[PDB]
Design a protein around this ligand. Structure first.
Ligand SMILES: Nc1nc2c(ncn2[C@@H]2O[C@H](COP(=O)(O)OP(=O)(O)O)[C@@H](O)[C@H]2O)c(=O)[nH]1
Ligand SMILES: Nc1nc2c(ncn2[C@@H]2O[C@H](COP(=O)(O)OP(=O)(O)O)[C@@H](O)[C@H]2O)c(=O)[nH]1
Lengths: 110, 378
């Protein structure tokens, strides 16, 4: 029995989904920048400088994902809010898969 | 522009102005009435307040905070020596004076604590300027009562560097007493107890106001006690509960501990006006959803020693001041953690049911009193 109260929580989640998509785009750009450094003509020292600037950008991306998680964690959805609970779980699993990809980059550079 | 009152805090700073017969606590660029006392240095720029705090994960070594713990101190000082192990930023010795060593705009730069505090003060000045739409030069800046002359002078110097004309430097418990107009009361000498509990430090001061003269009779407290410790106990409680229910240890994962910690601080705030708080964290650890709740009674039990522990400094302050608790005319609450009902109950019960001055936001009371003082000196 779909409620208007649930639509407010779904709206909250929709805003957070957009925010997740935008941070996801940054991650893709950082992956493309990483390929750039790997495939380019930078010498050892400048490669080290470039990957560290990228390390800072990947830590920022992780922090943005952690703050998304922290916003989602303010939600309280009763059992009846099935659509909200499923969207919330899907969004959290999506961010965790993105954080795992951030870690793959972050743990292995600079 | 008018004159403002600035509470230069260890972790958070606050600016207020007296206008139209009232005190306005000025919100910053992020809509926050309090600004973190944080400064960050990068390849091309300097960040102050919220911006600096948020960028800390990215720039931990170059993000400076806690300058109030170093200002006016010698390198050899117990507080400076004890604290640096924790601080991600380097603390060096420049002829007996601590400096914060940071990498800034492609060079290694060293800043004195007053230069760091001047950057925070510059932001507080800007906060007031954007609200008032006028240049702000005059300010009253608060300092802790136990501050020595060197510490007091260093704070005044941070003002001068920030472009401020420091009208007066006043004690934090004096500012909190001015906020409640305790000096305007009629009768004999008035013994006032200021109970100040924030996020990291606890300060108890007893003052005697006789014919408008403020005399600090005694100071006591705990340098490392506050709301963070209350969060810690809540975290211990949840980690234990997660262990009981799922037989898994979440402490292994620092991102799981952080999500739980952030939810704990928020649940604690709910427990100041409600007797129960609920938490829902999806896929917290090893894909397990943690849905739980805590009662105010349970939160109190978890922190029973810490809450009770707040009376020891109170008994000590009474002792140094040679006073009986029945001699305390007024009790002022300062700091965000004084919003805790149990803490309020302990303090009232200790003073035989005396009412507490808590009407002004505890986090803003010091800024409030300094805004009243700044107005008087204009
Ligand atoms: N589930 C749900 N979504 C809604 C509802 N109202 C708005 N939305 C959508 O959720 C998003 C929230 O955006 P909103 O602040 O309302 O407007 P916008 O900023 O102009 O896109 C948009 O995609 C809306 O179309 C509602 O009642 N329920
Ligand atoms: N329980 C509780 N704590 C609060 C509340 N508001 C603020 N705090 C706590 O107050 C602490 C910050 O203290 P504050 O007075 O702002 O300044 P500080 O001493 O410079 O850190 C944090 O640990 C907050 O969680 C509230 O409503 N309830």
């Amino acid at each position: 029995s779909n409620s208007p109260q649930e639509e407010v929580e779904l709206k909250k989640l929709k805003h957070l989904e957009k925010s997740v998509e935008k941070i996801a785009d940054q991650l893709e750009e950082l992956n493309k920048e990483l390929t750039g450094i790997q495939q380019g003509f930078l010498p050892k020292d400048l490669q080290a400088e470039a990957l560290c600037k990228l390390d800072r950008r990947v830590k920022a991306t992780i922090e943005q994902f952690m703050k998304i998680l922290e916003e989602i964690d303010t939600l309280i959805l009763p059992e009846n809010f099935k659509d909200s609970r499923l969207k919330r779980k899907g969004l959290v699993k999506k961010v965790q898969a993105f954080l795992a990809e951030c870690d793959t980059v972050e743990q292995n550079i600079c | 522009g008018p004159a403002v009152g600035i509470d230069l805090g260890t972790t958070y700073s606050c600016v207020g102005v007296f206008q139209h017969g009232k005190v306005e606590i000025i919100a910053n660029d992020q809509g926050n009435r309090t600004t973190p006392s944080y400064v960050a240095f990068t390849d091309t720029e300097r960040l102050i307040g919220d911006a600096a705090k948020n960028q800390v994960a990215m720039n931990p070594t170059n993000t400076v905070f806690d300058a109030k713990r170093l200002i006016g101190r010698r390198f050899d000082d117990a507080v400076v020596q004890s604290d640096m192990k924790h601080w991600p930023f380097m603390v060096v010795n420049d002829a007996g004076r601590p400096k914060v060593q940071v990498e800034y705009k492609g060079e290694t730069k060293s800043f004195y604590p007053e230069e760091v505090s001047s950057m925070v003060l510059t932001k507080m000045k800007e906060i007031a300027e954007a609200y008032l739409g006028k240049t702000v030069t005059n300010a009253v800046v608060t300092v802790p009562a136990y501050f020595n002359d060197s510490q007091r002078q260093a704070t005044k110097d941070a003002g001068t560097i920030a472009g401020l004309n420091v009208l007066r430097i006043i004690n934090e418990p004096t500012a909190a007493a001015i906020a409640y107009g305790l000096d305007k009361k009629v009768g004999a000498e008035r013994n006032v107890l200021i109970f100040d509990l924030g996020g990291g430090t606890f300060d108890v001061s007893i003052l005697t106001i006789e014919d408008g003269i403020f005399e600090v009779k005694s100071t006591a407290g705990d340098t490392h006690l506050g709301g963070e410790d209350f969060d810690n106990r809540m975290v211990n409680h949840f980690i234990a509960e997660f262990k009981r229910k799922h037989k898994k240890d979440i402490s292994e994962n620092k991102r799981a501990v952080r999500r739980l910690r952030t939810a704990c601080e928020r649940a604690k705030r709910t427990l100041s006006s409600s007797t129960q708080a609920s938490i829902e964290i999806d896929s917290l650890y090893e894909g397990i959803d943690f849905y739980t709740s805590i009662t105010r009674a349970r939160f109190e039990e978890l922190n029973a020693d810490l809450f009770r522990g707040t009376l020891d400094p109170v008994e000590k302050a009474l002792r140094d001041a040679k006073l009986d608790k029945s001699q305390i005319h007024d009790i002022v609450l300062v700091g965000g953690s004084t919003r805790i009902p149990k803490i309020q109950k302990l303090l009232q019960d200790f003073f035989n049911g005396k009412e507490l001055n808590k009407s002004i936001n505890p986090d803003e009371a010091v800024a409030y009193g300094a805004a009243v003082q700044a107005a008087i000196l204009s």
